[PDB]
């Protein structure tokens, strides 16, 4: 069975699925840079995702990297007081990008 | 004028004032054009051809037939192959998985080049995180006697148990320890190897956490830790090797120079084998050092390596 939800896959993709025998994730549904806004200073910094941490609804989805509404993700601060984690707010299956708010 | 360049490092690179000041004093503007201008190269792609499974002359053919540009480094060993241009995956080639070669840096070679492992003897260890260097221990050995492997991290042992069995070393007692209480565990009479438990941590092209997040408190306790690890290394034996990946003095040639006085059983022999520049005497209001000439040095711009220091010791009684 294939997933029709937007996911993030880490850079060790080439032979990663030990426990994901036939869990097809197409390359079109892979969004790498979340459109993250900063709460304390109303500026939006379009930064790459590093790690998918805690997706509610499913603990399968945490191990697949699914980016449904409420997922806490890790944000790369290479471009740069800052908080390393952000919680997503949109449903990227419906709209274009992934929209997250820092914690 | 100095403060102009200190404004042209902490703003140009986005760098810490604490490190920019402590790595410019008694260093030339020419040397400032060597070290600081070399943190964009980011580790030239060398390789460590495992001598156990295959000789190098039988591995030059293997990658070239798949279209890999290869050329040996200067004088040291034919083992080190510089990769220039390859399209075949740089970790997923069947020969990686076989254990014919491990992907290393050029700085990963030399602390074990300086050490000379012989037949039937035991080698002890304290902090070898990936296990790339313990490969060079148990290949010159040709799988005889004992080889200890150690690091103080339960998460990082997975790289060791991956690389040892990957490259086929057979003689590895890979075990997690606290490195300080090590002579009380066993204390094997034959030689030991120590490398880089460091706060100075040279070449920022690898880790840019050094660029921003290094204060004085790291330089207080981590040089103290690696200082005590020497005091356990000299209580194991027998040719001690202690090295680090840092150009700052508070890591090498202040830590080794402590343990030189602290035991009369310590002799510093000619460390490296091929090339590597001469060591200093005065370290900004520091002691007399005519004995510390042989502990070699390497720069990121004089040669295409990553700046580090080696110190090889001998014990008598």
């Amino acid at each position: 069975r294939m997933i029709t939800k937007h996911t993030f896959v880490g850079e060790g993709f080439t032979r990663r699925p030990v426990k994901m025998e036939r869990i097809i994730r197409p390359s079109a549904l892979r969004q790498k840079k979340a459109n993250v806004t900063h709460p304390e200073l109303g500026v939006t910094v379009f930064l790459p995702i590093l790690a998918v941490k805690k997706n509610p609804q499913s603990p399968m989805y945490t191990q697949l990297g699914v980016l449904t509404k409420g997922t806490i993700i890790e944000v790369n601060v290479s471009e740069l007081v800052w908080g390393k984690y952000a919680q997503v707010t949109n449903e990227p299956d419906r709209d274009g990008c992934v929209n997250a708010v820092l914690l | 004028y100095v403060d102009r360049l200190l404004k042209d490092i902490c703003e140009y690179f986005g760098y810490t004032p604490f490190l920019a000041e402590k790595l410019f004093n008694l260093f030339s503007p020419a040397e400032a054009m060597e070290f600081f201008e070399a943190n964009e190269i980011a580790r030239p792609i060398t390789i460590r051809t495992n001598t156990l499974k295959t000789r190098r002359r039988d591995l030059a053919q293997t990658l070239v037939n798949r279209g890999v540009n290869l050329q040996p480094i200067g004088s040291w060993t034919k083992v080190g192959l510089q990769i220039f241009d390859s399209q075949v995956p740089i970790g997923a080639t069947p020969e990686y998985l076989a254990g014919h070669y491990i992907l290393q840096a050029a700085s990963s070679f030399l602390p074990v080049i300086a050490l000379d492992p012989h037949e039937n003897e035991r080698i002890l260890d304290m902090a070898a995180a990936p296990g790339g260097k313990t490969t060079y221990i148990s290949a010159m050995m040709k799988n005889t006697g004992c080889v200890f492997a150690n690091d103080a991290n339960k998460s990082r042992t997975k790289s060791l148990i991956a690389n040892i069995h990957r490259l086929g070393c057979t003689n590895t007692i890979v075990c997690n320890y606290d490195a300080r209480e090590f002579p009380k565990v066993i204390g094997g009479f034959d030689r030991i190897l120590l490398d880089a438990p460091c706060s100075g941590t040279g070449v920022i092209g690898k880790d840019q956490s050094v660029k921003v997040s290094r204060t004085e408190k790291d330089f207080i306790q981590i040089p103290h830790l690696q200082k005590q690890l020497l005091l356990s290394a000299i209580d194991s034996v027998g040719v001690i090797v202690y090295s680090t990946c840092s150009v700052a003095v508070e890591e090498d040639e202040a830590v080794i120079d402590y343990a030189l006085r602290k035991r009369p059983n310590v002799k510093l022999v000619d460390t490296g084998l091929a090339i590597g520049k001469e060591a200093f005497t005065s370290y900004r209001g520091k002691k007399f050092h005519p004995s510390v000439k042989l502990a070699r040095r390497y720069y990121p711009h004089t040669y295409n390596v990553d700046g580090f220091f080696v110190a090889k010791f001998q014990k008598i009684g």
Partner: protein
């Protein structure tokens, strides 16, 4: 996992013609709009081959392959091979010449037959002694004229149209192994005005 279906009909031509691309160091690639000739010139020629592509379309560069992307018939692009390939002379010279087909077929074959002579004059200028010249050419009224000028400017001229072609298309891949490299070249010969001079009536 190549770029186009034009990739599978030179790797097929090498096996039939003694793996000539295996031994070859430098290659001048013509008319390659996809990289279906430089990819297979990378997997056949030895490492650091230094192969040069010329095509009318401007498109991307490929790793390990230098490719200039401009005109074929001008003197300035001839000064871009003069810009590079003066010190080294090409071992082989490839030709995937193909027009934008769909106009009468009479002209769709004659602008091809015209294009191969201009590719020849870029080849006769920049080829090593006893090399080769592989060419896509349409079977037409003026094919027998091209095979003759090939016959008197090369050693052995052999036509193919290998398997893994369309089978319906009127393609020929003709190879011309062995190159004369004369000091006296006939100027009236190589020009297309005298080449397609039609045979008199019976």
């Amino acid at each position: 996992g190549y770029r186009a279906r034009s990739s599978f009909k030179i790797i097929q031509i090498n096996e039939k013609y003694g793996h000539f691309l295996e031994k070859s160091k430098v290659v001048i690639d013509l008319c390659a709009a996809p990289g279906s000739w430089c990819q297979v010139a990378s997997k056949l020629c030895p490492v650091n081959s230094l192969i040069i592509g010329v095509d009318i379309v401007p498109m991307k560069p490929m790793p390990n392959v230098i490719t200039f992307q401009s005109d074929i018939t001008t003197e300035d692009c001839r000064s871009k091979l003069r810009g590079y390939m003066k010190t080294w002379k090409a071992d082989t010279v490839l030709h995937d010449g193909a027009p934008n087909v769909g106009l009468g077929w009479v002209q769709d074959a004659f602008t091809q037959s015209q294009l191969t002579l201009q590719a020849l004059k870029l080849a006769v200028e920049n080829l090593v002694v006893n090399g080769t010249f592989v060419t896509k050419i349409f079977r037409s009224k003026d094919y027998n004229k091209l095979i003759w000028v090939f016959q008197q400017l090369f050693e052995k001229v052999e036509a193919t149209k290998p398997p893994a072609s369309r089978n319906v298309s009127a393609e020929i891949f003709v190879v011309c192994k062995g190159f004369k490299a004369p000091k006296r070249l006939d100027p009236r010969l190589l020009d297309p005005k005298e080449v397609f001079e039609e045979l008199p009536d019976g």
